[PDB]
Coordinates of all heavy atoms in Angstrom, one line a residue:
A27 N 9.6 117.1 103.7 CA 10.5 116.6 102.6 C 9.8 116.4 101.3 O 10.4 116.6 100.1 CB 11.2 115.4 103.0
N28 N 8.6 116.2 101.3 CA 7.8 115.9 100.0 C 7.6 117.2 99.2 O 7.0 117.2 98.1 CB 6.5 115.2 100.4 CG 6.5 113.7 100.2 OD1 7.3 113.1 99.6 ND2 5.5 113.1 100.8
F29 N 8.0 118.3 99.8 CA 8.0 119.6 99.1 C 9.3 120.2 98.9 O 9.4 121.3 98.3 CB 7.1 120.5 99.9 CG 5.7 120.1 100.2 CD1 5.4 119.3 101.3 CD2 4.6 120.5 99.3 CE1 4.1 118.8 101.4 CE2 3.4 120.0 99.5 CZ 3.0 119.2 100.6
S30 N 10.4 119.5 99.3 CA 11.7 120.1 99.3 C 12.2 120.3 97.8 O 13.2 121.1 97.6 CB 12.8 119.3 100.0 OG 12.9 118.0 99.4
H31 N 11.6 119.7 96.9 CA 12.0 119.9 95.5 C 11.4 121.1 94.8 O 11.7 121.5 93.7 CB 11.7 118.6 94.7 CG 10.4 118.3 94.6 ND1 9.6 117.8 95.8 CD2 9.4 118.2 93.6 CE1 8.3 117.5 95.4 NE2 8.3 117.7 94.1
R32 N 10.3 121.6 95.4 CA 9.6 122.7 94.9 C 9.7 124.0 95.7 O 9.3 125.1 95.1 CB 8.0 122.4 94.9 CG 7.7 121.1 94.1 CD 6.3 120.7 94.4 NE 5.3 121.8 94.3 CZ 4.1 121.9 94.8 NH1 3.7 120.9 95.8 NH2 3.3 122.9 94.6
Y33 N 10.3 124.0 96.9 CA 10.5 125.2 97.7 C 11.8 125.1 98.4 O 12.5 124.0 98.4 CB 9.4 125.3 98.8 CG 7.9 125.4 98.1 CD1 7.3 124.2 97.9 CD2 7.3 126.7 97.9 CE1 6.0 124.4 97.4 CE2 6.1 126.7 97.4 CZ 5.4 125.5 97.1 OH 4.2 125.6 96.6
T34 N 12.3 126.2 98.9 CA 13.5 126.2 99.8 C 13.1 126.2 101.2 O 12.6 127.3 101.7 CB 14.4 127.4 99.3 OG1 14.6 127.5 98.0 CG2 15.8 127.3 100.1
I35 N 13.3 125.1 101.9 CA 12.7 124.9 103.1 C 13.8 124.6 104.0 O 14.2 123.4 104.3 CB 11.7 123.7 103.2 CG1 10.6 123.9 102.1 CG2 11.0 123.7 104.6 CD1 9.5 122.8 102.1
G36 N 14.4 125.7 104.7 CA 15.4 125.5 105.7 C 14.8 125.0 107.1 O 13.7 125.5 107.5
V37 N 15.3 123.9 107.6 CA 14.7 123.3 108.8 C 15.9 123.3 109.9 O 17.0 122.7 109.6 CB 14.2 121.9 108.5 CG1 13.8 121.2 109.8 CG2 13.1 121.9 107.5
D38 N 15.5 123.7 111.0 CA 16.5 123.8 112.2 C 15.9 122.9 113.3 O 14.9 123.3 113.9 CB 16.7 125.1 112.6 CG 17.9 125.4 113.5 OD1 18.4 124.3 114.2 OD2 18.5 126.4 113.5
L39 N 16.5 121.8 113.5 CA 16.2 120.8 114.6 C 16.9 121.1 115.8 O 18.1 121.4 115.8 CB 16.4 119.4 114.1 CG 15.5 118.8 112.9 CD1 16.1 117.5 112.5 CD2 14.0 118.8 113.3
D40 N 16.4 121.0 117.0 CA 17.0 120.9 118.3 C 16.4 119.8 119.1 O 15.4 120.0 119.8 CB 16.9 122.3 119.0 CG 17.6 122.4 120.3 OD1 18.4 121.3 120.6 OD2 17.6 123.4 121.0
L41 N 16.9 118.5 118.8 CA 16.4 117.4 119.6 C 17.3 117.0 120.7 O 17.2 115.8 121.1 CB 16.2 116.3 118.5 CG 15.3 116.6 117.3 CD1 15.1 115.4 116.3 CD2 14.0 117.4 117.7
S42 N 18.0 117.8 121.2 CA 19.0 117.6 122.3 C 18.1 117.2 123.5 O 16.9 117.5 123.5 CB 19.8 118.7 122.7 OG 19.1 120.0 122.8
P43 N 18.6 116.6 124.6 CA 17.8 116.2 125.7 C 17.1 117.4 126.3 O 17.5 118.4 126.4 CB 18.8 115.7 126.7 CG 19.9 115.2 125.9 CD 20.0 116.0 124.7
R44 N 15.8 117.0 126.6 CA 14.8 118.1 127.1 C 14.5 119.2 126.1 O 14.1 120.3 126.6 CB 15.3 118.7 128.5
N45 N 14.7 118.9 124.8 CA 14.3 119.8 123.8 C 13.7 119.1 122.7 O 14.3 118.0 122.1 CB 15.6 120.6 123.4 CG 16.1 121.6 124.4 OD1 17.2 121.4 124.9 ND2 15.2 122.5 124.7
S46 N 12.6 119.6 122.2 CA 11.9 118.9 121.1 C 11.4 120.0 120.1 O 10.2 120.1 119.9 CB 10.7 118.1 121.7 OG 10.0 117.3 120.6
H47 N 12.3 120.7 119.5 CA 11.9 121.9 118.8 C 12.2 121.7 117.3 O 13.2 121.1 116.9 CB 12.7 123.1 119.3 CG 12.7 123.4 120.8 ND1 11.5 123.7 121.4 CD2 13.7 123.3 121.7 CE1 11.8 123.8 122.7 NE2 13.1 123.6 122.9
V48 N 11.3 122.2 116.4 CA 11.5 122.3 115.0 C 11.1 123.7 114.6 O 10.0 124.1 114.8 CB 10.7 121.2 114.3 CG1 10.9 121.4 112.7 CG2 11.0 119.8 114.6
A49 N 12.0 124.4 113.9 CA 11.8 125.7 113.3 C 12.2 125.6 111.9 O 13.2 125.1 111.4 CB 12.5 126.8 114.0
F50 N 11.3 126.1 111.0 CA 11.4 126.0 109.6 C 11.0 127.3 108.9 O 10.2 128.0 109.4 CB 11.0 124.7 109.0 CG 9.5 124.6 109.1 CD1 8.6 124.8 108.0 CD2 8.9 124.1 110.3 CE1 7.3 124.7 108.1 CE2 7.5 124.0 110.4 CZ 6.7 124.2 109.3

């Protein structure tokens, strides 16, 4: 987030049970 004002950083979280994924 400390870079969200200088770049376009799409972030897709999947923190549902048994899932700990971050894709950006």
Side-chain angles (χ1 to χ4, degrees), residues 27-43 45-50:
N28 265 341
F29 301 85
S30 65
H31 62 294
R32 303 166 54 204
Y33 303 86
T34 309
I35 308 178
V37 175
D38 196 334
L39 299 167
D40 183 4
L41 308 184
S42 56
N45 289 120
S46 182
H47 309 294
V48 179
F50 62 102

